[PDB]
Amino acid sequence: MKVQHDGRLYSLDDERIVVYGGTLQYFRVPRNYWEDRLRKMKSHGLNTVETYIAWNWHEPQEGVFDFTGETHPQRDLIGFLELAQKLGLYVIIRPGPYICGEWKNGGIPDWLINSHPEILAKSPNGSFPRDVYYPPITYLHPTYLEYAMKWYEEVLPIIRDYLYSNGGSIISVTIDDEPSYWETIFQPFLTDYNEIIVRENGIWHSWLKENYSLGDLEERYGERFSDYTEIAPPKSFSEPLPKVLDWHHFKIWMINEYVRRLYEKIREYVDVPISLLDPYLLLAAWKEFYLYVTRHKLDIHLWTEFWYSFYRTFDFKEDKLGHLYFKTGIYRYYVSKLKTPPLSIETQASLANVIEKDEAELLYALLPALGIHNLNYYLYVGGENPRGYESHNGVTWDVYSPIGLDGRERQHVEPIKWIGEFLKSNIDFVDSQFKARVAFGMYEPYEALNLWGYKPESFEESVNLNEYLFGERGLLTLLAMSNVPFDVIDLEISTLEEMLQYEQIWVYSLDFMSREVQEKLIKYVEEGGNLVILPTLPYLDENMKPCTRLRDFLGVEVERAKARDNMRLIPYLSVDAEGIDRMVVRNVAREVKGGEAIAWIGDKVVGTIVRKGKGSAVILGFRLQYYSSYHDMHRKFVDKILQLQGVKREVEVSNRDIIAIPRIHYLVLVNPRDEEVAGKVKYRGVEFEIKMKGRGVLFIPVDVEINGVKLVYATATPIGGGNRRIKFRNHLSDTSEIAIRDGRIRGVKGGYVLQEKGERVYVIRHERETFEIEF
Amino acid sequence: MKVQHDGRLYSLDDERIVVYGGTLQYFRVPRNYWEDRLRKMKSHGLNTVETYIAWNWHEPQEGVFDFTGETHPQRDLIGFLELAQKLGLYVIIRPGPYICGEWKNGGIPDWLINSHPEILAKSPNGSFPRDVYYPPITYLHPTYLEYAMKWYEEVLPIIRDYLYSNGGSIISVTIDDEPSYWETIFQPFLTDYNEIIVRENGIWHSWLKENYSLGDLEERYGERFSDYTEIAPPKSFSEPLPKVLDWHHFKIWMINEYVRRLYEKIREYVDVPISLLDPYLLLAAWKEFYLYVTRHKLDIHLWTEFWYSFYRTFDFKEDKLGHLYFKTGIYRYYVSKLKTPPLSIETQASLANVIEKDEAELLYALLPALGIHNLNYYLYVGGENPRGYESHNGVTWDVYSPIGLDGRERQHVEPIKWIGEFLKSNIDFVDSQFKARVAFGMYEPYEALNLWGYKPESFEESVNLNEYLFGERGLLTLLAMSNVPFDVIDLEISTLEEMLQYEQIWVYSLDFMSREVQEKLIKYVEEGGNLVILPTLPYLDENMKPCTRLRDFLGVEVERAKARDNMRLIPYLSVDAEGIDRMVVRNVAREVKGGEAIAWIGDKVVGTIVRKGKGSAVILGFRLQYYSSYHDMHRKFVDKILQLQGVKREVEVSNRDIIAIPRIHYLVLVNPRDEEVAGKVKYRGVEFEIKMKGRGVLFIPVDVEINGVKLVYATATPIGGGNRRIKFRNHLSDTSEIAIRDGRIRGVKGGYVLQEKGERVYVIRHERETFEIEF
């Protein structure tokens, strides 16, 4: 009768489990099919069903609730929750108010909107047209809050009954969906100019008061103010940048206030974990979520999601790895700070035209490789929208779901299945934490800039971080493809103690960066850390006043060169260095002085290493990016930097195309390309050869006790077995190579022992992906 | 001693041949590998080898020439041309002046630009930085033209000697490369404002004389002028749109003049055909290329290229089908008018991080399928750039080429090999002309507007044809995926006779549309034609004055809604029809009056059919797009329109996922998704069932005399054999059906017969891709 957790896994009656689920939205699947679909789900090793509860659906007119299929069968929420329970599945419930979910108004009733348009959010140019999707609402408007609570006041009682804590199915409740201000936060001046915000001592004026003095504001916006009253909210980029960022963190704070209201209400009914998906549809900005929730002490379980393709074929190849490494990194950060378990509540299984299984497996199998071992697949069970409730897809709700509308199982099941068998068979993997010696240091203000797409005329460096940092050619993709799996740290949040857990810290820099954070960086270097910083050094603070503590600490004078915005005008230069010949780079390089030179464009020095105190700093005046080629000069440059600052990796590979993430007693191996790849692999004291025929991921055990047998290594993935027996998975080979400390091979189930190399290492030969070994 | 052609294939000595080639840039490969690499190319079945000739490379200093490899081995053009002949391969040669090719200045020498800056192009704001790639040059500037001819005069002798017609290897010579004003034509006011243009009686000024009066300009630009001299070239969009199109067409004209000059100089030394790659790097604007080259009677062979992924993984799936169908289409259109053979001179095989063989194949095989049966694979052989001449990639020039730097052969060789064997073995298929009963009506001015991304405040309809027409959800993608493989006709250039070769014509339509084209359409309908016209009718002529000819002829009052530019503010509407339920559409749907109503949104009628004269016209007030799902409601609406206007297809399929392209005695079956697909296909009187396991293409002979045996059908690709003997290829199954009118299957080489059904049909079972049947 209790749902608890540790840092790592949710517990039911002290029996700790791995949440492995799929989404079945009962309001979108015919009622008589529900039974079959939950059994099928269960048949793929899913233990958890997730579903939204749509306010829209269950209160289709003000006052008329129907949770028992009276008016319409698909309104039979009670039914569904008893059926799932009867079938042995656990339930994660998402009562909204907003469910997004490609559904009419994201779950908000028309009647609320059409008889209280005072709650509707407003642009600087007045109201939004009624034509538009997810009609934006002013969150802290009271009318909307009175009616939001009236929905929760009917539904949470029903959820109360079905809690696992009171002999039911439900193991977590989730607050709203991806609260992004109705997806208008990405445009700085779209929202919200509703007269409840905006007016003299409005929301706004009160938020300025609580966070700043006129001080402060007079330093930030470069203007004197008699009282907070005079500060109107910004309507364009002509206004000072620190103002626009305040307007950003203010809208974020408003979301957090709306979120807190819902949580506190939920807390009245529910004694199981309370959860939240991807606040703000951003990442760096979780900085604010973390501080907010530490300020107010709200036990909110931060849950995440992973989407890479919409209305388009599923496109997940090496290109997307910088982002995935980034997102899981920053997720890991805040989730290990809040000390709750990592969980992807929406892992993409629908809404791409096709989802090809090997690309899907690259996403799904890296999430556990990247520390997110609790997983839910959305949308699992294809459906169909009731009439009058359509939005984004019209009739259909089956764009290539794992199980379709007519019950068909689509290809992407094959990897959901096995990732399940793997997660459930290796508790030791799940109870690892992710290592990282290297980390990327995020400065949050840079997110906004890149989100909004705006660079001040007077800035030297581009804000297109999507190109240069996150995307297919981004630095972070280069780092992933260079076998440098990284943690992410938030530079403002993190203490120096946390920074000094890392050997290397990579920082991408723009024109501005706070004194405190430039002061932190100088200390990390001074203490024996190793910094890489790129493509310029900062020379301004958070409020755009001169500040060159970092520049001056290093004794590094960095040329001023304006990065070009016009695509045709962006140069290609070729960077030479020790051991590397003509590594291409995009956009202006900056001469860099002081320190021993390590990088050149002709005569011009564009890179330098500087030691101060126990450690060092590498400063590169160019945008180091991912570019693939036989010469492979970018990946070499990375290795070359790592040697210069003396960070040896945990894994070594004879072939750079082998991507490898160490998880202590497992070595996750990745071929991210659909191509034969082979070569040797030194890790953890051992070494072995591997051949990977196609694209995919293997979790390879090393120096570990599993199923009663001590293994040195095994070139395949453990997905179960029994006492002195191991069931292996190698779909990327005809062959596997096993080594063992103090046992022998009695026999093989799905193949035979084709070799001995001796000292107790054997080459197995299996004609299927799966096979067993008796020890 | 001759190189001729019919409209289909080039002929050597009356022997006709399929040009199946790769690029080897001798200047970028170590000379002492040229032999092995060329051998390898021949062992893949390539009969042609293409190469640039880099002015740059061979003329390192003004007047210092080298083509024998005195200074640097890779300068040995002569020795390469001899080695190519010695080993059997015919050469295609591209001497420039500009070669693109990711190479310093795109082939132009540094000394020319340094010692003569007066030839450099200018923006409205002045000179371009020297940093910039492919430093742009004014094409007609005498000094440039002088030095271009001095390069042509010191290379075209060497080409003369090795022409096929003088016992050599060179079967053609190409003008420049992709002449696009140095990739500055994409930007309307970037280029060219050099003083040789622009000046009173500049180029410009004389062009405006050639092509217009003060009539005309007085009407077009909406202002009285004294002379041509007062008219400045436009520098922004707040000049009137007709002027910006004239500026667009004038830049195109200059390129055509530059081309004519280079052509006129080539014709002096050469009798082999004179090729030109993708003029203007535009498509619709080949209208201007065709008009120009007819007016001047230049025997120019218009070649093409296909590229879809740069510095990123190769991504060719169903999403690019709209584009491919459109490109091949409009390439078929112009190259059948000019009555020259269709050739893809650059068919992508490098510059993508990985090129997966199934996606590569889907492109390489759809090119023949879509009528382009001579093919060259750029870049074939992986090289290294000589220090100094680096540009786009730095050192490297082996970004996943079919043959690498160390001699390795990569996975996209497998599809090149077989497509060779296919084209060569099947001259019938090559001598087909591509059917299309349905066609798309391109209106060239719309291209310019899409390319610039500028829509007038005043216009109702968006210019994002990339999204709504060409792209991954583009209407053209919908048509392709709905098995309506279409032709493309230029609405301005084509005559009413031509238009009536087609049962259905689709036209995407903005606010403006010429009287002479709006008159061509109202006649097409009345003469017994069928028009689908979307998403609004025009109300303005080519000069933005009122002209509602079409709109008054049909008797159709279409709404004035204004399409929204802001992503967030674009609506999702749900379109109903007879049989189709809640089809989704983005952006404003327009009420449509007159005709019988075929498509509804609530009570508002957003589509209609009009019968007028002998024929009819569908007019949809919405943007019909490609969206994939279970319900498949978009593809069904397409069927539902072809029913209405009575266009039966040539192929029928029990699974809509099977993509079929009819080529008379062959059927191109294509599975564009990597999934298991199967169904029954009726075509050409015969029916059968087919299973395709992965992504790829088959060419299936249906009711035809091949290698002396009468087939009804055969569920595999014919790739060679001998007498009463066919060699087959079916990489998408373990099994292939084979029917035959007259004969019986004697033996089976790479398999066995597994069945008979009766009346002479036989199910083969082959454990490999390839097999052979003897009759």
Curated annotation (Swiss-Prot), chains A, B:
Keywords associated with the record: Cytoplasm, Glycosidase, Hydrolase
Reported pH dependence: Optimum pH is 6.
Pfam families for this protein: GLMA_2nd, GLMA_C, Glyco_hydro_42
Places the protein is found:
Cytoplasm
Q: So where does substrate get bound?
A: Y52, G101, E102, D177, E178, E305, E346, Y378
Q: Where is the active site?
A: E178, E346
Provide the temperature dependence entry: Optimum temperature is 90 degrees Celsius.
Transmembrane residue ranges: none
- CDD domains named among the record's database cross-references: A4_beta-galactosidase_middle_domain
Q: What class of enzyme is it?
A: hydrolase
Quickly give the catalysed reaction: beta-D-glucosaminyl-(1->4)-N-acetyl-D-glucosamine + H2O = D-glucosamine + N-acetyl-D-glucosamine
UniProt lists the family membership as follows: Belongs to the glycosyl hydrolase 35 family.
Q: How is this protein named in the record?
A: Exo-beta-D-glucosaminidase
Q: Which organism is it from?
A: Pyrococcus horikoshii (strain ATCC 700860 / DSM 12428 / JCM 9974 / NBRC 100139 / OT-3)
